Design a protein around this ligand. Structure first.
Ligand SMILES: CCCCCCCCCCC1=C(C)C(=O)C(OC)=C(OC)C1=O
Ligand code: SF4
Ligand code: SF4
Ligand code: SF4
Ligand code: SF4
Ligand code: SF4
Ligand code: FES
Ligand SMILES: [Ca+2]
Lengths: 145, 213, 589, 905
């Protein structure tokens, strides 16, 4: 998970980084400067994680590419309402125990932490209204409210 | 191109209808044909329906009787309550199994000439009621002259079947008197309406979308 | 808590009253989605329980329904007493605005119940039909013969082992011997009904008023014992319009049965569709949106006006004035312009769906509704002044075939006859459904006498009130979906079906194998055009109904006929038949 | 074990996983990757339930029910909100790439993915991006491939590779581009590839033979039947539409075939739909052929039979017990002949004597999977009894199962079991004239002539028990292999000995009996299996009768002037020259058959019999189980001119018209009672199914689903008047949907599996007591005989070793799953699958003849000089030529015969 400047005064231990909603991991930290768009960074991360899926289990293999396409739309400014909620539900449903191995929980840790700490950059990509259907002439749609 | 029917209610045949039909040629001279045409014209322009209904199809038929349709214009509004004064039996409704002897009795009590229109899917075949208490079509025991599909056919569909019956009556051959001549009833084998209308029906390309009024 | 949730109704005071009177172990309460306390009682205590309910402080006065059920193939009977067959008794307390359903379990060999005819005289025809269709004997029944099937019928068709389709049996072959046999079986036998052939001075004439009579409203025979023109007694002979519609309910999927619901009361249309789709939506756990409620109410009121127009004009025609039927059918054509535009069909639209309606409203429907609402009131005032205020019509109808509140309650009479007795009971106000509580409309009531004239004029006022409801429907029409967002909405919205795979999968399985309703029992009561119409649906967990019981009001009214007309002239009976507002599809189902 | 599900207490097996325990209780958990026969792997993640450690726990945790043991004290919730949302999310993730294909997909209405999409309640699509796509492969004539519909559940590869031991199917690629199929285009080489169409929960693998004339499952008329293509007796659900047999589905029998068929049974049904089948009785007058109805055929045949001095009957192992018995009653017991040759009959009665008099239990097909060591002698099981080969592969995997059970690994954790076992397996030793398809898993394969295979069996029996007769002249290398086999079989707790009649030698069956007796004398739980040839070979052997050679010499001597041949082409069991001469000499030949055979060119009367799809009857399989097959459809429903009756109905009415001059079409149960009264050894066929008066609460059993469509239109072009549904006076099934097919109905004969919400083959779960177990009121079928108290004596007739002699070539039988069975080789889809005709030669013999691979050689057998291209067989022993039995012109009676004048021409 991503951490902010306030977490920089944290000892690099498993327990202390664990209580801050992250993982000590390999203890090889990576700094993100102000010039880096967080949506593009998480898109790069999720592209890596989706293409490195082994394909055994449904949530990782078929839900990481959905997050990749959502983040690609957000980076282009083609996000639609419900995209961020879909990302949050994907983070919830790819957690530990939902998938066969721990590749997908690790995949969704940066996405959920970046949405938690930098939500304003993700909402900046939502510009178009949600549209999943085209018009079929002769059939009146069921207009939800 | 004619079918000849001869009735035999007291013969060696138990299954209804008590008749025999055979495909023959037209029996039709310069005066008998003209007077037969005059009788056919008079019969087809004065068709008195029997006030008889079984179900919802009867509601549509009597709707055709009212002012918004005015089946009186064709001369077919007289609507006799007695089978003796009626010329046309419209089986307008389901042929219920309990009602089938009644329908047979009422058809028997009608007098010559008589025509039968089976109105609606129930009378045609049993319709949607393939069920224990329903005869699967009134033509299992009543000879039917015109079939109207629909559930119900709209009043103008009943009027269209009335015009179809008029064209069938206008070229039929019936005994001019019961004392002298052939007494069997000759009905022309018409071209089917499906094959007649196939050319103009298949050529349809676009219809109005179902989104407006 | 949604209205469709399963409830046992233990908080109903009638449960505590039955517990205090009979003990806690005397009966078993079943949790259903009927909205009604369902109580399984022992067969030996049925008459005691019925008497106790009849003499409660705010009593259960009307036997709404009585029928049977074949439970032998029901796999989900958890919490239910062991039963091969069962008989249920739906009783209504009007003053409580409550109802109860008693259930009696029966073994296969011991298929007999005590008769309910002493407590409720309208139980006679219900027990005759339950004997006819299930083979359940009712001990002490004065004449327990077949009522839907001919006398020479073998078997009981609503049993699970009786085949439904006509194509299971040999095709109908009318021979001379068969015609003579069934015509002998149809012949009235006055000795079997306790009638003499006459007195010493004169003979009684036994007259067939039907099935082919201009005043019989379909396939319907009343056998009149006539002393001159006085009716000594009559026997209404029904079952000539029996279509096996409940058996067909066990034979069609939940979706494919809707057109059959249309043809139960064939002048009703969408009114007949409404209780069935509401009961299925209770089984499915569906709460339809507001626009669906308003669309269904508008179609129901249009068909109520259609049916009332036919009823008023045919009453006037039966009284003798034949002119207003032409104009009234023109008004029906204006309604049909709107109804054809919306649903694509005149008489049986089949347009309501589980979870909504088949299509959205077409563009320009409000123009047609406004045209009809401008057209109707001057026409109705003309009918009133020309025919209904004629004193000869009044002399033919006022005081004719009159009964009071007690006679209406004891025969299960509902609708305009019951409210003509002064009892203010309409389902749309007492037990509101489909958003009827959001409309302002009055319920016309009579002065205490249910006359032919009073019933007709009450229906005229009901027509005016339906015009008010249609005005509110036209002016305040919600924007929104015409189908619910539920997964069991059958079929799904068509455009999403045509482009989305999961919607296509749902549509594919819903139209082919059928929507799966989880095992439950559901009930919906509505104010139909001719009285109270109800659907009682049992799902066994399949895509087909395990049991579809349709309560129709015309059955009760036709059973009431001999009590209310005995000792009158034949012309009074003609006017009475014209003022009942019945069709025989409703009677025989 | 006691578990709690949604606050309800249940008693389950603690050795089961939670998914199979909850499905056995009738609860609905969606699943894809788990299968009852394949174990759990936890791939699809669809079967999530919430688990709680205590009753006073409210947080919980989502787990895979297929990967979680159903131990004592577990609390789970299926209807938990998080579990329902996650299962819906798994379905939605599978839907993101799924093609918009249901109208043009053969799985629609039978699709597990459709059912689970509906079951989770997912019906709204919010994914808006692109769907991945795949190209397809050509997989041969039987299986159609559409990889767009794949949900990557891995069921196909787990079945094909782990279960069926196939090698040419696999998974390729990576993350969301995983591909399931062959490494290149080509026919799927497994004999059990057809089970993929039911194993795959989507429309990726579909039945191509059904796809040619496709109809949906609700439109099908089903019946419970028995596969007719070999002696194993796998239960099938044939389904028809518009008067043609459309599909063969697996009908679950927990005792015989459970979930799986072989490809011969699944795809070899096409002979039923041949347009050259007899549909009416036809009488030959000179060169003219006159079509008769049933009564004129019976009267004319009875008149000619009354005029005849002696009428003999020739039965067949193709025909049912009732038909063979009806022929036996028509002609008399002393005038009845089985249609098989003398040697075939000797081998069949020896196999029957070993089965019902050897004192050694014969296992059912499912029971074969529990044996600890297998010795197959002579019988090329994959080509002749294929489902036994599949069961033997499971028995071989039993060792990895035992090793994993020693490490406290649950029996459903299939991946851990396979990891522990690695390449370890139970001993399998197979003997044949050449290599077998079982050689990949066989501990040893002996390629030798049939006498040498019998001698190896006799040596194994002598080394197991010294009282068994010894065979002298065994090489030390063969002796060392014999000691290997003996040490394997003696250390086995449950040894199994498989043999059969297909090797064409009596001594191989005798040696197998000797080995089984020697193992039984050591106090081992030994089983013996005999593989017969045809569907009712064992029934014909129990009934008995003279050989075909005796019938031929009765016709040739003139002592018989009338012969009635029942469902027999007579060329498979005798030389065609002799058969044609004998049938031309006879003044009256009547042939009762459903296929256009070659002996109807000389038949004076041909009775159009029904095939198994249009008939009811009983057949006895290879282990002596009487099984009833039921009629699927009435052939006269569309074509009213069709007079196609059951063979026993024809022959019973013929006997009645011969005796009392009157026609009696009788009922099936009357014929069955006549069988069990006249033949006491066939008395068990009464209990194979209940009689025609059986009801489920007063109603019959439905042959078609409740949503069967088109009733008022499917015959409307013939006549707008709907007829009555055809009546079934013979059985308890009705030819309509107006009947019972409830999964809780107290019956054993299930025509098809359907439950609300379960339209796929996964609906068989609801019809079982526990999933993957037995049908919940017992599997249909009954064993005719029990294990005898006493066994046989040792057979002392040890043959000498095979000796090649000049100019004389011993015919080694080579059977083919596609080709060696008569009726299924008549099917048009088998022609592409069938091999090109050939003759196998040793390299030394081919070099001695101066013949290379592919050259045509001509040989003469019984006045038939036929030519065949040469294929070189490394494993075939010199002095033999390999011939494909049962093909066109190569009768199976040629097995073990000799050959003359084999020259290059
Ligand atoms: C004759 C001029 C037009 C008026 C049409 C008749 C009025 C409406 C028919 C009413 C009716 C119904 C519904 C009806 O169902 C019925 O039974 C068949 C009748 O008896 C013959 C009826 O009279
Ligand atoms: S979470 Fe692990 S097991 Fe599942 S597909 Fe991804 S990498 Fe493979
Ligand atoms: S065809 Fe339809 S409208 Fe006509 S009687 Fe039958 S159900 Fe009624
Ligand atoms: S595999 Fe199933 S869900 Fe997919 S297209 Fe075929 S029927 Fe539809
Ligand atoms: S091809 Fe079928 S069985 Fe194989 S992984 Fe795909 S969906 Fe599963
Ligand atoms: S093993 Fe034999 S009985 Fe079984 S499916 Fe194959 S051919 Fe049929
Ligand atoms: S069935 Fe359990 S994860 Fe697939
Ligand atoms: Ca049969």
């Amino acid at each position: 998970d991503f951490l902010t400047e306030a977490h920089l005064d944290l000892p690099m231990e498993f327990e202390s980084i664990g209580k801050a909603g992250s993982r000590l991991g390999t203890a090889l930290a990576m700094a993100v400067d102000h010039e880096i768009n967080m949506v593009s960074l998480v898109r790069n991360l999720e592209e890596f994680f989706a293409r490195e899926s082994c394909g055994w289990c449904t949530p990782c293999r078929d839900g990481l590419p959905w997050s990749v396409k959502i983040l690609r739309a957000l980076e282009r400014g083609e996000g639609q309402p419900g995209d961020i909620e879909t990302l949050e539900q994907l983070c919830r449903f790819l957690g530990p125990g939902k998938t066969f191995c721990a590749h997908a929980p690790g995949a969704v840790e940066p996405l959920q932490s970046a949405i938690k700490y930098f939500r304003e950059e993700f909402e900046a990509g939502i510009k178009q209204p949600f549209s999943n259907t085209h018009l079929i002439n002769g059939i009146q749609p069921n207009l939800l409210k | 191109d004619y079918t000849l029917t001869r009735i035999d209610p007291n013969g060696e045949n138990d299954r209804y209808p008590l008749q025999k039909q055979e495909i023959v040629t037209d029996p039709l001279n310069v005066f008998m044909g003209k007077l037969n045409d005059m009788v056919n014209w008079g019969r087809k322009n004065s068709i008195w329906p029997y006030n008889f209904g079984l179900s919802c199809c009867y509601v549509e038929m009597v709707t055709s009787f009212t002012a918004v349709h005015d089946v009186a214009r064709f001369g077919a509004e007289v609507l006799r309550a007695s089978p003796r004064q009626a010329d046309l039996m419209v089986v307008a409704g389901t042929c219920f199994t309990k009602m089938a002897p009644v329908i047979q009795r009422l058809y028997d009590q009608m007098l010559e000439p008589k025509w039968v229109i089976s109105m609606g899917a129930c009378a045609n075949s049993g319709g949607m009621y393939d069920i224990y208490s329903v005869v699967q079509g009134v033509d299992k025991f009543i000879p039917v002259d015109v079939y109207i599909p629909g559930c119900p056919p709209r009043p103008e569909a009943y009027m269209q079947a009335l015009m179809l019956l008029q064209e069938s009556i206008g070229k039929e051959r019936r005994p001019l008197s019961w004392v002298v001549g052939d007494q069997g009833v000759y009905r022309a084998n018409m071209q089917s309406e499906r094959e007649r209308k196939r050319g103009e029906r298949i050529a349809v390309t676009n219809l109005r979308t179902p989104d407006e009024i | 808590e949604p209205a469709w949730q399963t409830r046992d109704h233990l908080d109903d005071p009638v449960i505590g009253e039955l517990r205090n009177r009979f003990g806690p172990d005397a009966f078993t309460v079943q949790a259903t989605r009927t909205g009604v306390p369902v109580v399984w009682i022992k067969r030996e205590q049925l008459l005691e329980v019925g008497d106790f309910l009849k003499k409660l402080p705010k009593p259960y006065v009307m036997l709404f329904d009585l029928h049977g059920m074949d439970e032998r193939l029901r796999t989900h009977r958890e919490g239910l007493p062991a039963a091969d067959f069962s008989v249920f008794y739906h009783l209504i307390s009007i003053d409580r605005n409550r109802d109860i359903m008693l259930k009696v379990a029966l073994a296969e060999n011991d298929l007999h119940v005590p008769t309910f005819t002493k407590l409720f005289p309208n139980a006679n025809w219900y027990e005759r039909e339950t004997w006819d269709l299930f083979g359940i004997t009712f001990d002490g029944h004065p004449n327990l013969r077949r009522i839907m099937m001919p006398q020479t019928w073998k078997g009981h068709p609503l049993r699970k082992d009786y085949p439904a389709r006509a194509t299971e049996f040999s095709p109908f072959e009318l021979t001379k011997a068969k015609q003579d046999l069934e015509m002998e079986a149809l012949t009235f036998k006055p000795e079997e009904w306790g009638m003499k052939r006459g007195t010493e001075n004169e003979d009684f004439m036994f007259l067939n008023l039907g099935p082919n009579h201009p005043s019989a409203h379909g396939a319907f025979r009343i056998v009149l014992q006539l002393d001159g023109e006085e009716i000594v007694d009559c026997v209404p002979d029904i079952g000539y319009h029996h279509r096996g519609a409940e058996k067909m309910g066990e034979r069609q999927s939940w979706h494919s049965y809707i057109p059959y619901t249309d043809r139960i009361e064939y002048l009703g249309g969408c009114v007949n569709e409404m209780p069935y789709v509401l009961a299925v939506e209770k089984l499915a756990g569906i709460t339809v949106p507001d626009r669906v409620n308003v669309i269904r109410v508008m179609l129901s009121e249009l068909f109520r006006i259609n049916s009332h127009l036919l009823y008023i004009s045919t009453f006037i025609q039966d009284v003798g004035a034949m002119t207003p039927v032409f104009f009234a059918f023109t008004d029906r054509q204006k309604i049909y312009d709107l109804v054809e535009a919306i649903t694509g069909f005149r008489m049986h639209p089949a347009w309501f769906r589980i979870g909504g309606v088949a299509h959205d409203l077409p563009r320009g429907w409000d123009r047609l509704l406004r045209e009809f609402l401008d057209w109707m009131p001057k026409r109705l005032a003309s009918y009133e002044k020309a025919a209904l205020q004629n004193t000869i019509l009044k002399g033919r109808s006022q005081g004719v075939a009159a009964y009071g509140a007690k006679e209406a309650l004891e025969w299960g009479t509902t609708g305009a006859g019951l409210r003509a007795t002064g009892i203010d009971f309409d389902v749309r106000k007492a037990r509101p459904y489909s958003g009827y509580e959001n409309f302002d409309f009055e319920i016309p009531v009579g002065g205490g006498v249910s006359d032919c004239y009073t019933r007709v004029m009450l229906k005229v006022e009901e027509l005016r009130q339906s015009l008010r409801i249609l005005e509110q429907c036209l002016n305040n029409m919600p924007e929104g979906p015409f189908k619910a967002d539920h997964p069991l909405t059958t079929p799904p919205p068509k455009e999403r079906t045509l482009q989305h795979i999961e919607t296509l999968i749902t549509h594919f399985l819903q139209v082919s194998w059928g929507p799966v309703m989880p095992a439950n029992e559901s009930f919906q009561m509505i104010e139909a055009t001719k009285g109270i119409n109800s659907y009682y649906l049992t799902s066994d967990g399949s895509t087909m109904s395990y049991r579809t019981r349709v309560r129709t009001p015309s059955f009760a009214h036709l059973q009431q006929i001999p009590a209310a007309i005995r000792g009158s002239l034949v012309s009074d009976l003609i006017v009475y038949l014209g003022s009942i507002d019945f069709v025989m599809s409703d009677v025989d189902r | 074990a006691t578990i709690h599900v949604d606050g309800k207490e249940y008693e389950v097996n603690g050795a089961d996983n939670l998914l199979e325990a909850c499905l056995s209780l009738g609860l609905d958990i969606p699943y894809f990757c788990w299968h009852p026969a394949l174990g759990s792997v936890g791939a699809c993640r669809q079967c999530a339930v919430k688990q709680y450690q205590n009753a006073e726990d409210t947080r919980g945790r989502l787990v895979m029910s297929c990967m979680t043991p159903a131990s004592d004290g577990t609390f789970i919730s299926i209807d938990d909100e998080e579990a329902k949302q996650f299962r819906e999310s798994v379905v939605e993730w599978l839907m993101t790439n799924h093609p918009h294909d249901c109208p043009v997909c053969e799985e629609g209405g039978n699709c597990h993915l459709q059912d689970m999409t509906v079951m989770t309640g997912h019906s709204f699509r919010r994914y808006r991006f692109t769907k991945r796509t795949h190209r397809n492969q050509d997989l041969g004539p039987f299986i159609s491939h559409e990889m767009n519909r794949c949900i990557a559940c891995y069921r196909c590869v787990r079945y094909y590779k782990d279960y069926a031991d196939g090698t040419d199917l696999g998974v390729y690629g990576a993350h969301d581009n995983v591909y399931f199929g062959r490494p290149e285009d080509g026919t799927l080489e497994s004999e059990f590839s057809g089970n993929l169409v039911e194993i795959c929960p989507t429309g990726v693998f579909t039945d191509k033979t059904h796809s040619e004339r496709y109809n949906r499952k609700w439109d099908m008329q089903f019946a419970p039947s028995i596969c007719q293509q070999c002696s194993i007796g796998c239960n099938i659900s044939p389904g028809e539409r518009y008067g043609e047999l459309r599909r063969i589905e697996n009908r679950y029998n927990g005792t015989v075939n459970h979930y799986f068929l072989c490809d011969r049974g699944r795809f070899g049904y096409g002979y039923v739909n041949l347009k050259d089948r007899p549909r009416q009785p036809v009488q030959r007058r000179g060169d003219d052929f006159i079509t008769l109805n049933a009564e004129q055929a019976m009267q004319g045949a009875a008149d000619i039979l009354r005029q005849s001095k002696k009428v003999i009957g020739i039965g067949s192992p193709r025909a049912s017990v009732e038909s063979n018995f009806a022929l036996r009653e028509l002609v008399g017991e002393e005038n009845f002949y089985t249609g098989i040759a003398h040697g075939e009959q000797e081998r069949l009665q020896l196999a029957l004597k070993v089965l019902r008099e050897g004192g050694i239990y014969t296992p059912a097909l499912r029971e074969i999977e529990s044996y600890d060591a297998v010795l197959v002698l002579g019988e090329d099981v994959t080509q002749t009894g294929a489902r036994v080969a599949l069961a033997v592969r499971q028995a071989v995997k039993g060792k990895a199962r035992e090793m994993a059970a020693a490490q406290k690994v649950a029996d459903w954790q299939i991946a851990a079991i396979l990891n522990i076992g690695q390449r370890a397996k139970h001993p399998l030793f197979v003997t044949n004239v050449d290599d077998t398809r079982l050689d990949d898993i066989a501990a040893w394969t002996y390629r030798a002539p049939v006498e040498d295979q019998a001698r190896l069996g006799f040596a194994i029996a002598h080394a197991l028990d010294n009282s068994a007769p010894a065979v002298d002249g065994i090489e030390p290398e063969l002796q060392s292999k014999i000691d290997v086999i003996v040490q394997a079989l003696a250390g086995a707790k449950k040894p199994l000995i498989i043999s059969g009649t297909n090797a064409g030698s009596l001594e191989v069956i005798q040696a197998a009996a000797n080995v089984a007796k020697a193992l039984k004398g050591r106090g081992a739980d030994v089983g013996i299996t005999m593989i017969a040839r045809s569907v009712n070979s064992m029934g014909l052997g129990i009934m008995g009768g003279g050989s075909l050679e005796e019938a031929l010499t009765e016709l040739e001597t003139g002592r018989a002037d009338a012969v009635v041949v029942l469902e027999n082409d007579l060329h498979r069991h005798a030389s065609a020259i002799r058969v044609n001469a004998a049938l031309a000499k006879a003044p009256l030949v009547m042939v009762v058959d459903h296929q256009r055979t070659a002996i109807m060119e000389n038949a004076h009367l041909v009775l159009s019999a029904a095939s198994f799809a249009e008939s009811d009857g009983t057949v006895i399989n290879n282990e002596g189980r009487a099984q009833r097959f039921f009629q699927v459809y009435d052939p006269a429903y569309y074509d009213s001119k069709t007079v196609m009756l059951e063979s026993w109905r024809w022959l019973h009415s013929l006997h009645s018209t011969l005796l009392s001059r009157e026609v009696d079409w009788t009922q099936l149960d009357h014929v069955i009672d006549a069988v069990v009264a006249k033949i006491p050894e066939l008395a068990g066929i009464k209990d194979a199914a209940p009689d025609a008066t059986f009801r489920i609460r007063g109603q019959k059993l439905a042959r078609e689903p409740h949503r069967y469509s088109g009733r008022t239109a499917m015959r409307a072009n013939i006549s707008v008047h709907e007829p009555r549904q055809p009546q079934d006076i013979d059985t308890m099934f009705t030819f309509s949907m107006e009947g019972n097919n409830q999964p809780t109905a107290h019956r054993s004969q299930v025509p098809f599996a359907w439950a609300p919400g379960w339209n796929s083959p996964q609906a068989w779960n609801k019809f079982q007591d526990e999933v993957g177990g037995k049908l919940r009121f017992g599997d249909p079928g009954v064993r005719l005989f029990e294990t005898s108290e006493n066994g046989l004596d040792y057979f002392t007739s040890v043959p000498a070793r095979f000796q090649p002699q000049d100019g004389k070539w011993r015919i080694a039988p080579y059977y083919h799953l596609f080709g060696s069975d008569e009726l299924s080789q008549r099917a048009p889809v088998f022609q592409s699958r069938m091999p090109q005709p050939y003759i196998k030669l040793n390299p030394a013999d081919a070099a001695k003849l101066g013949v290379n691979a592919g050259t045509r050689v001509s040989f003469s057998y019984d006045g038939n000089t036929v030519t065949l291209p040469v294929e070189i067989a490394e494993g075939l022993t010199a002095g033999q030529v390999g011939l494909p039995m049962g093909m066109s012109g190569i009768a199976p009676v040629l097995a073990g015969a000799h050959l003359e004048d084999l020259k290059e021409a």
